Amino acid sequence: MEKTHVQLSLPVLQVRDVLVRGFGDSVEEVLSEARQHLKDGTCGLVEVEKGVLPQLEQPYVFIKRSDARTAPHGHVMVELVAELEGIQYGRSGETLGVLVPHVGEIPVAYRKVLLRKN
Ligand SMILES: O=C(O)Cc1csc2ccccc12
């Protein structure tokens, strides 16, 4: 069945290339859709710098580090946290980036993660 964590290599996208700038319209929807796109191989990652979040659509889905002691098989352990109007749904570690749908944009790198599914 579904293991608790899955190894994934996520394409890193530049913010100005992203065509679909979020996963939906509520905290529960964006987390659900993020998880579905991760399962389908159609999720990208944008690294957060000044100017990035105002160019994307709320609610946001972040991947954040879930454990800063080890990174098994060269993949950092992460979990999902959503944000709407400055309030976060989950508490976790440092942000690795914001997740968005991937619809064919050309990435600039890949980020290896070990994702906690739920
Ligand atoms: O391990 C799998 O084949 C399933 C899977 C890959 S990414 C993700 C995200 C949420 C729920 C399930 C999954």
PDB file of N, CA, C and O in Angstrom, residues 6-13 23 32-45 99-105 107 110 115:
ATOM      1  N   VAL A   6       7.681   8.871   0.782  1.00  0.00           N
ATOM      2  CA  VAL A   6       8.026   8.473  -0.574  1.00  0.00           C
ATOM      3  C   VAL A   6       9.161   9.348  -1.065  1.00  0.00           C
ATOM      4  O   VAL A   6       9.138  10.570  -0.854  1.00  0.00           O
ATOM      5  N   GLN A   7      10.131   8.726  -1.757  1.00  0.00           N
ATOM      6  CA  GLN A   7      11.241   9.454  -2.364  1.00  0.00           C
ATOM      7  C   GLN A   7      10.792  10.058  -3.678  1.00  0.00           C
ATOM      8  O   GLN A   7      10.258   9.350  -4.542  1.00  0.00           O
ATOM      9  N   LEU A   8      11.044  11.361  -3.846  1.00  0.00           N
ATOM     10  CA  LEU A   8      10.650  12.060  -5.050  1.00  0.00           C
ATOM     11  C   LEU A   8      11.767  13.016  -5.430  1.00  0.00           C
ATOM     12  O   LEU A   8      12.473  13.544  -4.564  1.00  0.00           O
ATOM     13  N   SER A   9      11.933  13.229  -6.728  1.00  0.00           N
ATOM     14  CA  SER A   9      12.799  14.284  -7.253  1.00  0.00           C
ATOM     15  C   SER A   9      11.902  15.337  -7.890  1.00  0.00           C
ATOM     16  O   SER A   9      11.300  15.092  -8.943  1.00  0.00           O
ATOM     17  N   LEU A  10      11.796  16.532  -7.236  1.00  0.00           N
ATOM     18  CA  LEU A  10      10.848  17.554  -7.694  1.00  0.00           C
ATOM     19  C   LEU A  10      11.525  18.539  -8.636  1.00  0.00           C
ATOM     20  O   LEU A  10      12.594  19.059  -8.314  1.00  0.00           O
ATOM     21  N   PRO A  11      10.930  18.840  -9.790  1.00  0.00           N
ATOM     22  CA  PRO A  11      11.496  19.886 -10.656  1.00  0.00           C
ATOM     23  C   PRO A  11      11.343  21.263 -10.034  1.00  0.00           C
ATOM     24  O   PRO A  11      10.260  21.625  -9.563  1.00  0.00           O
ATOM     25  N   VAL A  12      12.436  22.028 -10.059  1.00  0.00           N
ATOM     26  CA  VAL A  12      12.466  23.384  -9.528  1.00  0.00           C
ATOM     27  C   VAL A  12      12.182  24.351 -10.678  1.00  0.00           C
ATOM     28  O   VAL A  12      12.866  24.317 -11.709  1.00  0.00           O
ATOM     29  N   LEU A  13      11.161  25.193 -10.521  1.00  0.00           N
ATOM     30  CA  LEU A  13      10.688  26.054 -11.600  1.00  0.00           C
ATOM     31  C   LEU A  13      10.970  27.498 -11.248  1.00  0.00           C
ATOM     32  O   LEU A  13      10.962  27.871 -10.078  1.00  0.00           O
ATOM     33  N   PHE A  23      -2.897  25.708  -6.236  1.00  0.00           N
ATOM     34  CA  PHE A  23      -3.627  24.450  -6.290  1.00  0.00           C
ATOM     35  C   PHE A  23      -5.114  24.593  -6.032  1.00  0.00           C
ATOM     36  O   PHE A  23      -5.827  23.580  -6.034  1.00  0.00           O
ATOM     37  N   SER A  32      -4.964  18.884  -0.509  1.00  0.00           N
ATOM     38  CA  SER A  32      -5.449  17.714  -1.235  1.00  0.00           C
ATOM     39  C   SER A  32      -4.889  17.670  -2.660  1.00  0.00           C
ATOM     40  O   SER A  32      -4.354  16.648  -3.112  1.00  0.00           O
ATOM     41  N   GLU A  33      -4.971  18.788  -3.381  1.00  0.00           N
ATOM     42  CA  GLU A  33      -4.508  18.828  -4.756  1.00  0.00           C
ATOM     43  C   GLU A  33      -3.006  18.700  -4.831  1.00  0.00           C
ATOM     44  O   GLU A  33      -2.495  18.039  -5.731  1.00  0.00           O
ATOM     45  N   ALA A  34      -2.289  19.311  -3.879  1.00  0.00           N
ATOM     46  CA  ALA A  34      -0.831  19.121  -3.857  1.00  0.00           C
ATOM     47  C   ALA A  34      -0.491  17.637  -3.739  1.00  0.00           C
ATOM     48  O   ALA A  34       0.367  17.113  -4.476  1.00  0.00           O
ATOM     49  N   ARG A  35      -1.144  16.938  -2.797  1.00  0.00           N
ATOM     50  CA  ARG A  35      -0.856  15.522  -2.611  1.00  0.00           C
ATOM     51  C   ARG A  35      -1.183  14.713  -3.870  1.00  0.00           C
ATOM     52  O   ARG A  35      -0.421  13.822  -4.258  1.00  0.00           O
ATOM     53  N   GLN A  36      -2.296  15.028  -4.551  1.00  0.00           N
ATOM     54  CA  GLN A  36      -2.644  14.330  -5.793  1.00  0.00           C
ATOM     55  C   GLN A  36      -1.615  14.578  -6.894  1.00  0.00           C
ATOM     56  O   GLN A  36      -1.186  13.644  -7.589  1.00  0.00           O
ATOM     57  N   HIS A  37      -1.197  15.822  -7.072  1.00  0.00           N
ATOM     58  CA  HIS A  37      -0.182  16.108  -8.092  1.00  0.00           C
ATOM     59  C   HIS A  37       1.168  15.467  -7.752  1.00  0.00           C
ATOM     60  O   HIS A  37       1.890  15.005  -8.655  1.00  0.00           O
ATOM     61  N   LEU A  38       1.523  15.398  -6.466  1.00  0.00           N
ATOM     62  CA  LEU A  38       2.735  14.671  -6.091  1.00  0.00           C
ATOM     63  C   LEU A  38       2.623  13.205  -6.498  1.00  0.00           C
ATOM     64  O   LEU A  38       3.557  12.638  -7.083  1.00  0.00           O
ATOM     65  N   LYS A  39       1.464  12.589  -6.239  1.00  0.00           N
ATOM     66  CA  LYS A  39       1.263  11.184  -6.602  1.00  0.00           C
ATOM     67  C   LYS A  39       1.322  10.976  -8.118  1.00  0.00           C
ATOM     68  O   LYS A  39       1.787   9.932  -8.581  1.00  0.00           O
ATOM     69  N   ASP A  40       0.903  11.968  -8.900  1.00  0.00           N
ATOM     70  CA  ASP A  40       0.798  11.880 -10.363  1.00  0.00           C
ATOM     71  C   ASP A  40       2.069  12.346 -11.072  1.00  0.00           C
ATOM     72  O   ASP A  40       2.150  12.265 -12.305  1.00  0.00           O
ATOM     73  N   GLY A  41       3.056  12.856 -10.339  1.00  0.00           N
ATOM     74  CA  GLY A  41       4.264  13.341 -10.960  1.00  0.00           C
ATOM     75  C   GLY A  41       4.125  14.681 -11.641  1.00  0.00           C
ATOM     76  O   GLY A  41       4.902  14.978 -12.548  1.00  0.00           O
ATOM     77  N   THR A  42       3.171  15.510 -11.217  1.00  0.00           N
ATOM     78  CA  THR A  42       2.839  16.751 -11.904  1.00  0.00           C
ATOM     79  C   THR A  42       2.904  17.912 -10.917  1.00  0.00           C
ATOM     80  O   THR A  42       2.094  18.849 -10.977  1.00  0.00           O
ATOM     81  N   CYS A  43       3.897  17.881 -10.022  1.00  0.00           N
ATOM     82  CA  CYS A  43       4.082  18.938  -9.037  1.00  0.00           C
ATOM     83  C   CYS A  43       5.494  19.509  -9.193  1.00  0.00           C
ATOM     84  O   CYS A  43       6.476  18.762  -9.336  1.00  0.00           O
ATOM     85  N   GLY A  44       5.604  20.836  -9.180  1.00  0.00           N
ATOM     86  CA  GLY A  44       6.889  21.503  -9.185  1.00  0.00           C
ATOM     87  C   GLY A  44       7.109  22.280  -7.895  1.00  0.00           C
ATOM     88  O   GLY A  44       6.230  22.392  -7.027  1.00  0.00           O
ATOM     89  N   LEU A  45       8.310  22.844  -7.801  1.00  0.00           N
ATOM     90  CA  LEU A  45       8.745  23.559  -6.599  1.00  0.00           C
ATOM     91  C   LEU A  45       9.350  24.883  -7.015  1.00  0.00           C
ATOM     92  O   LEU A  45      10.190  24.924  -7.920  1.00  0.00           O
ATOM     93  N   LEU A  99       5.057  24.771  -3.450  1.00  0.00           N
ATOM     94  CA  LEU A  99       4.669  23.808  -4.473  1.00  0.00           C
ATOM     95  C   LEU A  99       3.633  24.407  -5.418  1.00  0.00           C
ATOM     96  O   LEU A  99       2.756  25.165  -4.987  1.00  0.00           O
ATOM     97  N   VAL A 100       3.725  24.047  -6.702  1.00  0.00           N
ATOM     98  CA  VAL A 100       2.759  24.494  -7.707  1.00  0.00           C
ATOM     99  C   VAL A 100       2.525  23.347  -8.672  1.00  0.00           C
ATOM    100  O   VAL A 100       3.367  22.455  -8.818  1.00  0.00           O
ATOM    101  N   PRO A 101       1.408  23.359  -9.381  1.00  0.00           N
ATOM    102  CA  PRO A 101       1.262  22.388 -10.472  1.00  0.00           C
ATOM    103  C   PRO A 101       2.367  22.557 -11.500  1.00  0.00           C
ATOM    104  O   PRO A 101       2.870  23.664 -11.732  1.00  0.00           O
ATOM    105  N   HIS A 102       2.764  21.443 -12.108  1.00  0.00           N
ATOM    106  CA  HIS A 102       3.741  21.426 -13.188  1.00  0.00           C
ATOM    107  C   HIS A 102       3.022  20.998 -14.464  1.00  0.00           C
ATOM    108  O   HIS A 102       2.444  19.917 -14.512  1.00  0.00           O
ATOM    109  N   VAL A 103       3.017  21.865 -15.469  1.00  0.00           N
ATOM    110  CA  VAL A 103       2.297  21.611 -16.712  1.00  0.00           C
ATOM    111  C   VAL A 103       3.234  21.768 -17.895  1.00  0.00           C
ATOM    112  O   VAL A 103       2.825  22.217 -18.968  1.00  0.00           O
ATOM    113  N   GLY A 104       4.482  21.349 -17.739  1.00  0.00           N
ATOM    114  CA  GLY A 104       5.404  21.317 -18.858  1.00  0.00           C
ATOM    115  C   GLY A 104       6.481  22.369 -18.828  1.00  0.00           C
ATOM    116  O   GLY A 104       7.327  22.383 -19.734  1.00  0.00           O
ATOM    117  N   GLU A 105       6.501  23.242 -17.828  1.00  0.00           N
ATOM    118  CA  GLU A 105       7.586  24.212 -17.721  1.00  0.00           C
ATOM    119  C   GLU A 105       8.941  23.518 -17.600  1.00  0.00           C
ATOM    120  O   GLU A 105       9.066  22.435 -17.046  1.00  0.00           O
ATOM    121  N   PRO A 107      12.382  22.947 -15.990  1.00  0.00           N
ATOM    122  CA  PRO A 107      12.988  23.248 -14.688  1.00  0.00           C
ATOM    123  C   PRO A 107      14.433  23.729 -14.802  1.00  0.00           C
ATOM    124  O   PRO A 107      15.100  23.556 -15.829  1.00  0.00           O
ATOM    125  N   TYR A 110      16.619  20.010  -9.797  1.00  0.00           N
ATOM    126  CA  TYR A 110      15.760  19.059  -9.117  1.00  0.00           C
ATOM    127  C   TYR A 110      16.103  19.052  -7.645  1.00  0.00           C
ATOM    128  O   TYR A 110      17.271  19.196  -7.264  1.00  0.00           O
ATOM    129  N   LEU A 115       9.121  12.647   1.152  1.00  0.00           N
ATOM    130  CA  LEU A 115       7.910  13.359   1.526  1.00  0.00           C
ATOM    131  C   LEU A 115       7.056  12.525   2.465  1.00  0.00           C
ATOM    132  O   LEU A 115       6.727  11.371   2.161  1.00  0.00           O
TER     133      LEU A 115
END
